[PDB]
Design a protein around this ligand. Sequence first.
Ligand SMILES: CNc1cc(-c2ccc3[nH]ccc3c2)nc(S(C)(=O)=O)n1
Length: 108
Amino acid sequence: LTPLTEKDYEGLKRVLRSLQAHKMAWPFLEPVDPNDAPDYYGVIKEPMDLATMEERVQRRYYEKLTEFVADMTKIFDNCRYYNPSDSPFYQCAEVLESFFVQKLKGFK
Ligand SMILES: CNc1cc(-c2ccc3[nH]ccc3c2)nc(S(C)(=O)=O)n1
């Protein structure tokens, strides 16, 4: 696959900022607070959140788009596994993942 260029990285920053600004993004902005879900980190093996992804973008951690998409998909998969399908948290993953897909297609 094609390495992420400096120009690609500016696009990833734009995509990440779009997700961080979405009104349904709140549960994903930062790592789950263990005090608000004391079982969360025993349930979810590989936590992920948008602030961790922002740190990784700023550090040029990602070499291929597939790696960035994989971290984003972890956010949504973790949410749907931890929460029941009628939870407001689950709803956020449904909305934000479709929004991410729209933005990802534009990024290409
Ligand atoms: C009750 N279920 C939950 C609770 C939370 C949660 C709680 C407190 C929090 N403080 C800072 C982030 C943060 C996230 N996040 C989810 S999530 C990421 O959508 O799977 N599900």
